[PDB]
Amino acid sequence: DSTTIQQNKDTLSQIVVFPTGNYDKNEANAMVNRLANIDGKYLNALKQNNLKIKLLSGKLTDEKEYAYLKGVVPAGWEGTGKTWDDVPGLGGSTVALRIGFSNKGKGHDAINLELHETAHAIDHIVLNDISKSAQFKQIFAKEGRSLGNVNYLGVYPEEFFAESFAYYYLNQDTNSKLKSACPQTYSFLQNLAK
């Protein structure tokens, strides 16, 4: 609800890092507002571990900490002439997101950039790679293709987990879509948030 979103925006004021230089500040605010949909327990767990959600005004590999990715072809992306230089988001041990690239198809396959990448960090930092736990692996074996992208989401449980989390928290449409397609994944995320 409207007041829950504000509470999470408060929590995020100590998580989000805005970039140097000029950019669409309203769009950066929109991304923070979408992150505020995430259950506050997760956001405070990220803050406890000093995970920073970096909004970028340039390319991922323009940041010194990601320079090692310059020229690197992502897993599964060979032959397209695109590399990490072109990838708008990264999540796991860190989180970095190009402002403006939230929507599906803006250089990435996720329903929403910032929720997908932040799900990676929650998975890895907060929950000890729960996407590789025995329980989620069983669910992934049954439902891992049911969000589509069968040769990507259907192959990597960490990507299926991240995408399912994004569906669960993006909006009411994507939440009910997850419930219909991946009922056991939806219940798993419900029990995790409970």
Q: Least separation, in Å, of the C-beta of 162 and Zn ion? A: 5
Q: Which of 10, 31, 52, 46 is nearest to 127 (CA)?
A: 46
The number of helices, as runs of H, and strands, as runs of E, in the chain is: 8, 4
CB neighbours (10 Å) of residue 17? 11
Active site residue 78: no
Q: Is 108 annotated as ligand-binding?
A: no
CB of 108 to Zn ion, least distance (A): 8
By CB under 5 A, what part of segment 116-175 binds Zn ion?
159, 162
Structure tokens at 59: 């390319």
Helix 25-35, helix 2-12: angle, nearest 10? 110
- State yes or no: 167 annotated in a binding site: no
120 is in an annotated binding site: yes
- Number of residues in contact with Zn ion under rule CB under 5 A: 2
Integer Cα distance of 181 and 179 in angstroms:
6
For the CB of residue 132, give the shortest distance to Zn ion in the complex, in Å: 14
* Active-site hit among 117, 143, 158, 163: 117
Residues that bind Zn ion (CB under 5 A): 159, 162
Catalytic residues: 117
Binding site for Zn(2+): residue ranges?
Answer: 116, 120, 152, 159
